[PDB]
Design an enzyme around this catalytic site. Structure first.
Site, PDB file in Angstrom:
ATOM      1  N   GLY A 157      25.233  32.198 -10.921  1.00  0.00           N
ATOM      2  CA  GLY A 157      24.794  30.842 -10.798  1.00  0.00           C
ATOM      3  C   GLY A 157      25.880  29.873 -10.753  1.00  0.00           C
ATOM      4  N   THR A 158      26.882  30.011 -11.743  1.00  0.00           N
ATOM      5  CA  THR A 158      27.950  29.059 -11.667  1.00  0.00           C
ATOM      6  C   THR A 158      28.833  28.997 -10.697  1.00  0.00           C
ATOM      7  OG1 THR A 158      29.570  30.285 -12.682  1.00  0.00           O
ATOM      8  CG2 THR A 158      27.952  29.479 -14.141  1.00  0.00           C
ATOM      9  N   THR A 191      23.195  44.213  -9.287  1.00  0.00           N
ATOM     10  CA  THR A 191      23.764  43.700 -10.960  1.00  0.00           C
ATOM     11  C   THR A 191      22.177  42.887 -11.464  1.00  0.00           C
ATOM     12  OG1 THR A 191      25.910  44.007 -10.596  1.00  0.00           O
ATOM     13  CG2 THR A 191      25.108  42.816 -12.312  1.00  0.00           C
ATOM     14  N   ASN A 199      31.262  45.289  -3.386  1.00  0.00           N
ATOM     15  CA  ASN A 199      31.821  46.344  -4.536  1.00  0.00           C
ATOM     16  C   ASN A 199      31.659  48.008  -4.316  1.00  0.00           C
ATOM     17  OD1 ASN A 199      32.853  44.003  -6.075  1.00  0.00           O
ATOM     18  ND2 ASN A 199      31.137  44.081  -7.506  1.00  0.00           N
ATOM     19  N   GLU A 225      47.837  28.548  11.260  1.00  0.00           N
ATOM     20  CA  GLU A 225      47.577  29.526  12.684  1.00  0.00           C
ATOM     21  C   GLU A 225      46.438  30.294  12.667  1.00  0.00           C
ATOM     22  OE1 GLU A 225      51.270  30.954  14.002  1.00  0.00           O
ATOM     23  OE2 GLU A 225      51.382  32.590  12.732  1.00  0.00           O
TER      24      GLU A 225
HETATM   25  N1  GTP Z   1      34.863  42.469  -7.781  1.00  0.00           N
HETATM   26  C1  GTP Z   1      34.560  42.136  -8.768  1.00  0.00           C
HETATM   27  N2  GTP Z   1      33.013  41.268  -8.641  1.00  0.00           N
HETATM   28  C2  GTP Z   1      32.529  41.064 -10.035  1.00  0.00           C
HETATM   29  C3  GTP Z   1      33.242  41.230 -11.186  1.00  0.00           C
HETATM   30  N3  GTP Z   1      32.497  40.689 -12.247  1.00  0.00           N
HETATM   31  C4  GTP Z   1      31.336  40.367 -11.450  1.00  0.00           C
HETATM   32  N4  GTP Z   1      31.306  40.745 -10.175  1.00  0.00           N
HETATM   33  C5  GTP Z   1      30.128  40.673  -9.186  1.00  0.00           C
HETATM   34  O1  GTP Z   1      29.760  39.092  -9.140  1.00  0.00           O
HETATM   35  C6  GTP Z   1      28.469  39.030  -9.296  1.00  0.00           C
HETATM   36  C7  GTP Z   1      27.965  38.767 -10.442  1.00  0.00           C
HETATM   37  O2  GTP Z   1      28.574  37.474 -10.602  1.00  0.00           O
HETATM   38  P1  GTP Z   1      29.073  36.646 -11.924  1.00  0.00           P
HETATM   39  O3  GTP Z   1      30.588  36.363 -11.811  1.00  0.00           O
HETATM   40  O4  GTP Z   1      28.989  37.534 -13.053  1.00  0.00           O
HETATM   41  O5  GTP Z   1      28.550  35.184 -12.164  1.00  0.00           O
HETATM   42  P2  GTP Z   1      28.776  34.074 -12.934  1.00  0.00           P
HETATM   43  O6  GTP Z   1      29.880  33.478 -12.191  1.00  0.00           O
HETATM   44  O7  GTP Z   1      29.392  34.570 -14.304  1.00  0.00           O
HETATM   45  O8  GTP Z   1      27.784  33.077 -13.133  1.00  0.00           O
HETATM   46  P3  GTP Z   1      26.576  32.976 -14.385  1.00  0.00           P
HETATM   47  O9  GTP Z   1      26.028  34.381 -14.643  1.00  0.00           O
HETATM   48  O10 GTP Z   1      25.626  31.819 -14.419  1.00  0.00           O
HETATM   49  O11 GTP Z   1      27.577  32.667 -15.652  1.00  0.00           O
HETATM   50  C8  GTP Z   1      27.844  40.527  -9.038  1.00  0.00           C
HETATM   51  O12 GTP Z   1      27.551  40.874  -7.600  1.00  0.00           O
HETATM   52  C9  GTP Z   1      29.017  41.501  -9.550  1.00  0.00           C
HETATM   53  O13 GTP Z   1      28.937  42.569  -9.290  1.00  0.00           O
HETATM   54  C10 GTP Z   1      34.604  41.528 -11.126  1.00  0.00           C
HETATM   55  O14 GTP Z   1      35.266  41.639 -12.217  1.00  0.00           O
HETATM   56  N5  GTP Z   1      35.120  41.989 -10.084  1.00  0.00           N
END
Ligand code: GTP
Ligand code: GTP
Ligand code: GTP
Ligand code: GDP
Ligand code: MG
Ligand code: MG
Ligand code: MG
Lengths: 430, 442, 42, 67, 38, 442, 442
Positions: free
Chosen positions: G143-144, G178, G205, G253
């Site tokens: 969301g954020t 997730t 991922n 570039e």
């Molecule tokens: N590569 C990678 N992907 C991640 C990681 N943590 C979460 N994700 C992925 O990012 C997505 C979840 O996004 P989040 O970053 O948890 O969302 P957010 O920015 O916290 O937004 P809010 O839940 O509203 O706080 C999913 O697809 C997860 O698989 C990480 O540490 N590394």
């Protein structure tokens, strides 16, 4: 490349006794366990089924399981019974009562740990382990419930090996037990998930083999168990003797199974002929092939003429020409072309082994994957639906602990197995 | 001078038994490696050197490896009659087969065994002073022959580079068949073999059965007969390296004369005086009769009819009592024939070889004894019919992705099926384009 | 940079040694060959 | 009956023999059949005499020329 | 035939499109040998 | 050209039995000390003198002492087959063992037995006219071998001075182990071996076991096999003093060529034609093949991989039918290899020796008979890895004083553990510094 | 020279921790911002400026902001090991999360925080003199990340105009998932990202899990491993800007060379020498081997197969000991391959880069140390399949308005869903059109 055998229940222990008699005879093992053979060809693969005990002796790689020791005392009293290792006999103190739930949940969980301990002790001794081979009936009580429980546990512990089963299923004409359909349905549900390849035998087909082909006046269970032991010992022959075109259980599975759930097979053994007639007709490849496809010599009640062959395999034992084998399989495929599924260009695999079974000039064992096996399951499902609508004997199973949901799952899975075979029967290229 | 033989799987080991029986009996090496010389005066000729090396005590050992994933057939060789001839390190055997899966041989199981094989080949190549190629015998119908043969040819092609690789290959017969999954293994093998082989010899068991039924009088043949005929063919082609002759032919001359374009390297093989002992003394067997014999389709060891295609190059090996003038008269008569046609861009279609050593007779053999023989290897567009039938069987079976879960489970991407099938489609269209008459001039 | 030149040096030395060895072997074989021709003539 | 999956004409008979042992036996590897027939005794004696004489004359010529 | 669902229909449609693309590439093959005049 | 052998403890006496069995059978002295004459006319020959001295009546007696604290093994030698070969005073045995305690051997028990040993070594050195070293065989894992070996080497170093001392030492294997207290004894053994030896060759039983399983075909080897291999190595190294040859090598040449700095004297050892009788008649064994063999890690008798380090010096001993030109060609081929690297300050990395006497074959032995062999001793920085694992095991146990009360009770200060551990740490830093390229120029 | 990094939400901040750990360790700054007292800084040069600015006392502080709506992760950054590195104003945190709602971030909550972020970015941008872009890290599934990333990119794009904005974006994997609402958030994010990002790199991922299973030997990977791989990729792509090299590559570039039409700015990334620390020491790995590796689907860090499409542009970054002639030979060999196809309007398909600084090794890391590496960014029509399947999942959920009431309560007209879905449909049609051969009819 060593095989481990498991014998469960009364039928399994008796068939195992006859099988180990046939194997000990073919390798020249005395009933005392001493090797007395007369050619190195017998000795060079003895490890496949036997372990070596000190100063000459061999012991058979088998686990015997039963809930009442009566059968164990019967096999121990038999002529070859002494060969079996005493620690390999596992038994409880009360019977299965012909009830699947007791055999699977109450006495099963009590004994199963000792069986897994014995199977691991036997498995870890092999330098390279091949698949397990299990013989049991689905209509009984301890055979069906604890056999399927143990199959599930061995599939969890050894998922990369092969799982092969020989199974006895209730006849369509006379029941030996009233509650046979429940035990059969639950067992088929367990097998279709756990097994890699499953062979099915009807006692009615062995009686028809005895009456029409052997003309026996008063056959007994010893004859039926000898026919089964002969074919069982025949399927593994290419694993343990030299030949012009070697074969293996995994290679049979790879050539026979088109899709992973379609692993139920028909069985046959060709050189059957009555003692009076045998002096009048010599063995030859045309005679073996003609007998091989004759439905009188097949060990299931379903008839091939109502279905079509997806795949088949033939293993030949004996000194013979490859020209007669390939041209016979081509001639049979061309003349009966309507009975073979058209999207596979060749349905038959052949294999040749140099050493025949004792007393036969040549022999072949036949394994067939035919959609007519769907007819056996539909009859059992009919009898199951007739008893279940009326809750005919369900309180025994529910009192042991079964969820009614288990019965509906097994019914749904069996109905889907019949439907998938029927759909592949009527499939087309389009 | 020297050549190294690589035997893979069931067909390759069984054909190897017949080949080494023949090379021993032709040179005169006993089953224990000794040569029972009749005189000490004079010196022993060097002709064995192509296939054998001698120890300081004078024992001979052969320049070959036998490769298999199942032990049984190699253990049978270890326990057979020639136990003392082979070096035990050369006979390599694994624990379990590739179960008719190309994926199991190539990715999962052959990857463990390949480094020992390369170490043995390196140990052989260090004990040579004029290696001029590898000869490979395998069947493409089975799992380990296809998968390990491809992986091993790839590694040799990277390590040795320019050295030539000539293959004798047993392909799936056009209507006789032995296993259901033969089209997948043959297509995937042919994809690797296309890039990493210089000449490929094609064999079909149904043709050798037909040849043994029509010319010899054998009603119930078995693999030992076919393998002895294949051994005779290999002995005829390699005779040019081992004995004196009027017109020698080095394996690079073979590659230079038979292959016009780098992908067009699949050749047909035939052998002329296939005759029984009782028939041989009622007939003369002149050069022109056996030369007329090699062009009839009844003589071929592959089931294809060359009248439906065009020849691009022919290589004719004569061994025995032949005089060049008779070869010239025969080739001029063939050129006169109207049922033999060459593509118009290949006017000088023939290469000849003449060797003085007549073919050897094997005690249990079925061929008669003859003073001369001719063997032919030829490049023809007719081979496109064999691929078209394998690809058609693949398309029927692949339409339902038959058995595919085995291949995906053992480690292979599903994409590899489509890539190989598209490459074989391009090879078929290449054979269509090369055989098209140049009627258009700009 | 010097390593490539040094490797080329050993490669050239090995090649020339092999050629000289082959020439010596050819001469030694040839002598006996023509001697035994002469004996056969007599 | 004991004759199920067996033959009463010749029971208790096992054919412990493979294809390769019959096909690649020691008879087929014998080199005595590939030798051309030996000469008569008179020709052998004359061959020894002629070889010895040729050796002696060649050695005498070599000694005379190279001293 | 098995019961029609969303995921099965999606897989069948994508797989049929995959097969059609593969067949189209098979039937539209271009050459690789160089027989062109200099 | 005489040499005196000192055998300490159980491993040293058992290895001594195999060594003296081999030296007797190689020279031809019978177990009763008499040499049966073969020719009636002629000189007697004199080659035994390096290891045996003769009495005026012609009996032979060997230049060795056997040292042990427990009687059983030496009493078995006294009651065995060679009872009459040794002088009874030479076989010295105490009453009770050092109980795997280096402190017990060094301080409490070895001080009683050491003076008889010094009197016998003095009586041998007085019966010499050319002495070129002491050879010492012992294991550093046990109590009496470590403690009495150190005390005796210190006394020898004061009494004999400049005379050379070459040690064959069995070090604790990197994962096979026999006793818990091995790290303490091996660490304390260090200073004794660092300042009181000229070259120390280290052996680990796990490597010789691997060599006997892989090359020979023995499924269940025992110490007699390993001891026979060690005896063969010692016979190869001392052959240069005893038989005719093209290029002799005196024991001082080893120290001059192998040791760059006075503490950097620990060397690796390997042996080439370890082969079985069935394989030996299938293969030729030329100089280049065995030279290639000594550099493969499958040939070494110590468990270390030299590819993880750099060579500083190599000494190659060839014995048998070898010609110097082939040795030079082989060494030039090794020098060409890219996986063999020398430190840039050591351009002339090799010393060669060539002897005509081929290796002897022992009636109950497991090695085949071969016409030539090569033996190698080499100094390499890879040896630093063995000390790091000993230091890790010592640090694990010493962090909680796991067994120190035994050592402190038998007479040793706790300070000795830290001092010895710091000296071996400095030896590790020496091996790190010597192998660093001189990239800095001022 | 200067670049500013913006880290948004959870994935972007956690990947940022690994990135700044790597960039710190690569330059050699301590965690407290001070240069080591032992380094001599021989270049005496301003290499830090791409990522760091120095204080007048010589402390370093990095050019980054960390933006999150929940406190916990940023409080972990404030209390961790790098506490003293960041300026406390740089770590900005709101009160409450956007609860996987794009609407909550964009409309309700991010609108409060956005003016502080813009003021921080302004304070950074006035203290620069040759800024050449923004690096943005976010996931479009949450969301954020979606709502505030879009709002901030919109404001940055109006205020700064032509200045480049480069995004590294983690999209929801095609079957690993997730949260339930990922398709809605990813569609609504992608609508804003299409207009307001200059290049977007896509990661899944499940693909990085597959790569870590096949190439690395990790049975149980976690997000820290993926983040270390991402940090390596970012360091490889930006090293060409920061250190001396044969062929440097400025960030401007890329847009000129990789983007044919202004909407076609989404690129695939892959990395070659993914190997574990324990093994792979033996393989040196030539240029052509790693170039062949980057085209195999086992090497990619995004789950798409390029054999189902056509390449439009490729950017190849080689780092380490590579010579341009080998890069040229490798790219010409790749160009030769028949299973690699380029759109006919892009004949000159490749850009190369060569930098001398080899990749850094991190003490806890799982990659081996290697002398050379290659990194790829590539434009291909295959990417159209990922959007079409996401759109199918959106259509499936939206057909029943499965969750829409949350979004409508948080502020959106139903029309906004249909507008965005039609724009992504138009993006699908763009990928259809660019891939059209479009022969010239006449
Ligand atoms: N590569 C990678 N992907 C991640 C990681 N943590 C979460 N994700 C992925 O990012 C997505 C979840 O996004 P989040 O970053 O948890 O969302 P957010 O920015 O916290 O937004 P809010 O839940 O509203 O706080 C999913 O697809 C997860 O698989 C990480 O540490 N590394
Ligand atoms: N001519 C000839 N054909 C043979 C021979 N042995 C096997 N074949 C044929 O080759 C094919 C079988 O290939 P195999 O060699 O058995 O396959 P494989 O190499 O053993 O592969 P795996 O089964 O995985 O071990 C069939 O078409 C056989 O007819 C032989 O000795 N001679
Ligand atoms: N190669 C070889 N190693 C041996 C032999 N005997 C013992 N060892 C090894 O040497 C170490 C044991 O040393 P010992 O010789 O038994 O110790 P010790 O000299 O008897 O010392 P005490 O036990 O105090 O009497 C272990 O690592 C054994 O494996 C042998 O005969 N040959
Ligand atoms: N073919 C065959 N069937 C048998 C044999 N023994 C028992 N059966 C059948 O198996 C069923 C009885 O199952 P049983 O083995 O008693 O089950 P258990 O009580 O669980 O061991 C009946 O249908 C019997 O006819 C035998 O030796 N051969
Ligand atoms: Mg096979
Ligand atoms: Mg002791
Ligand atoms: Mg969050």
């Amino acid at each position: 490349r060593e095989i481990v055998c498991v014998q469960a229940g009364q039928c399994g222990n008796q068939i195992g006794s006859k099988f180990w008699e046939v194997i000990s005879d073919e390798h020249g093992v005395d009933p005392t366990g001493t090797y007395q053979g007369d050619s190195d060809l017998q000795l060079e693969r003895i490890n496949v089924y036997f372990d070596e005990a000190t100063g000459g002796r061999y012991v058979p790689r088998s686990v015997l399981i039963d809930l009442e020791p009566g059968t164990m005392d019967s096999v121990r009293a038999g002529p070859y019974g002494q060969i079996f290792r005493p620690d390999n006999f596992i038994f409880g103190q009360s019977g299965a009562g012909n009830n699947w739930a007791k055999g699977h949940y109450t006495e099963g969980a009590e004994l199963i740990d000792s069986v897994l301990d014995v199977c691991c002790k036997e498995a870890e001794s092999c330098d390279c382990l091949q698949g397990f081979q299990i013989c049991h009936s689905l209509g009984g009580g301890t055979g069906s419930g604890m056999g399927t429980l143990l199959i599930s546990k061995l599939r969890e512990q050894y998922p990369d090996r092969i799982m092969m089963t020989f199974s006895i299923i209730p006849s369509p004409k006379v029941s030996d037990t009233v509650v046979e359909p429940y035990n059969t349905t639950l067992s088929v549900h367990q097998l279709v998930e756990n097994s890699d390849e499953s062979m099915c035998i009807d006692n009615e087909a062995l009686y028809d083999i005895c009456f029409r082909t052997l003309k026996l006046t008063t056959p007994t269970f010893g004859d039926l168990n000898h026919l089964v032991s002969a074919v069982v010992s025949g399927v593994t022959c290419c694993l343990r003797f030299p030949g012009q075109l070697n074969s293996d259980l995994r290679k049979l599975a790879v050539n026979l199974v088109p899709f992973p759930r379609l692993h139920f097979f028909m069985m046959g053994f060709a050189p059957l002929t009555s003692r009076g007639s045998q002096q009048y007709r010599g063995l030859s490849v045309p005679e073996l092939t003609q007998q091989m496809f004759d439905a009188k010599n097949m060990m299931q009640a379903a008839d091939p003429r109502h279905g079509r062959y997806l795949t088949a395999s033939a293993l030949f034992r004996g000194r013979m020409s490859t020209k007669e084998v390939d041209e016979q399989m081509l001639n049979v495929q061309n003349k009966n072309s309507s009975y073979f599924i058209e999207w596979i260009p060749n349905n038959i695999k052949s294999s040749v082994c140099d050493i025949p079974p004792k007393g036969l000039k040549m022999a072949v064992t036949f394994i067939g994957n035919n959609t007519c096996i769907q007819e056996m399951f539909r009859r059992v499902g009919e009898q199951f639906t007739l008893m279940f609508r009326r809750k005919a004997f369900l309180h025994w199973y529910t009192g042991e602990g079964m969820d009614e949901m288990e019965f509906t799952e097994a019914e749904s899975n069996m109905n889907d197995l019949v439907s998938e075979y029927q759909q592949y029967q009527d499939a087309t290229i389009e | 001078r020297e050549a190294i033989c690589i035997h893979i799987g069931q067909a390759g080991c069984q054909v190897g038994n017949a080949c080494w029986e023949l090379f021993c009996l032709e040179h005169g090496i006993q089953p224990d490696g000794a040569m029972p010389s009749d005189k000490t005066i004079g010196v022993e000729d060097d002709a064995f050197n192509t296939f054998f090396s001698e120890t300081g005590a004078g024992k001979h050992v052969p320049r070959a490896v036998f490769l298999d994933l199942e032990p049984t057939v190699v253990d049978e060789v270890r326990t057979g009659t020639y136990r003392q001839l082979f070096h035990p390190e050369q006979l390599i055997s694994g624990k379990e087969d590739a179960a008719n899966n190309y994926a199991r041989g190539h990715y999962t199981i052959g990857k463990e065994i390949v480094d020992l094989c390369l170490d043995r080949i390196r140990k052989l190549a260090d004990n040579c002073t004029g290696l001029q190629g590898f000869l490979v015998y395998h069947a493409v119908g089975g799992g380990t022959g296809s998968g390990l043969g491809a992986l091993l040819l790839e590694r040799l092609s990277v390590d040795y580079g320019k050295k030539s690789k000539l293959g004798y290959t047993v392909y799936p017969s056009p209507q006789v068949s032995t296993a259901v999954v033969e089209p997948y293994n043959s297509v995937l093998s042919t994809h690797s073999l296309l890039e990493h082989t210089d000449v490929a010899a094609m064999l079909d068991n149904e043709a050798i059965y037909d040849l043994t039924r029509r010319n010899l009088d054998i009603e119930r043949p078995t693999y030992t007969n076919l393998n002895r005929l294949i051994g005779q063919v290999v002995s005829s082609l390699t005779a040019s390296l081992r004995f004196d002759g009027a017109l020698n032919v080095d394996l690079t001359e073979f590659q230079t004369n038979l292959v016009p374009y780098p992908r067009i390297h699949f050749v047909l093989t035939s052998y002329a005086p296939v005759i029984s002992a009782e028939k041989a003394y009622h007939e003369q067997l002149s050069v022109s009769e056996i030369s007329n014999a090699v062009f009839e389709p009844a003589s071929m060891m592959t089931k294809c009819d060359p009248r439906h295609g065009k020849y691009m190059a022919c290589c004719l090996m004569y061994r025995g009592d032949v005089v060049p003038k008779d070869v010239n008269a025969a080739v001029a008569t063939i050129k006169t024939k109207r049922t033999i046609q060459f593509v118009d861009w290949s006017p000088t279609g023939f290469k000849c070889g003449i060797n003085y050593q007549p073919p050897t007779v094997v005690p249990g053999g079925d061929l008669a004894k003859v003073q001369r023989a001719v063997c032919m290897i030829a490049n023809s567009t007719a081979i496109a019919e064999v691929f078209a039938r394998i690809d058609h069987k693949f398309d029927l079976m692949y339409s339902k992705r038959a058995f595919v879960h085995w291949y995906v489970g053992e480690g292979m991407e599903e994409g590899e099926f489509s890539e190989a099938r598209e490459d074989l489609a391009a090879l078929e269209k290449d054979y269509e384009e090369v055989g098209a008459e140049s009627a258009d001039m700009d | 940079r010097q390593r490539e030149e040094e490797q080329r040096a050993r490669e050239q030395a090995q090649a020339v040694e092999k050629r000289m060895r082959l020439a010596a072997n050819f001469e030694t074989r040839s002598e006996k060959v023509y001697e035994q021709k002469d004996l056969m003539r007599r | 009956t004991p004759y199920v999956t067996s033959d009463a004409r010749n029971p208790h008979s096992r054919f412990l023999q493979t294809t390769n042992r019959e096909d690649y036996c020691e008879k087929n590897a014998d080199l005595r059949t590939l030798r051309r027939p030996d000469l008569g005794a008179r020709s052998r004696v004359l061959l020894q005499v002629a070889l010895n004489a040729a050796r002696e004359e060649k050695n005498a010529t070599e000694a005379e020329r190279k001293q | 035939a098995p019961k029609r669902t969303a995921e099965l229909l999606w897989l069948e449609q994508q797989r049929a499109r995959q097969y059609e693309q593969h067949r189209k590439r098979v039937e539209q093959q271009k050459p690789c040998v160089d027989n062109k005049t200099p």
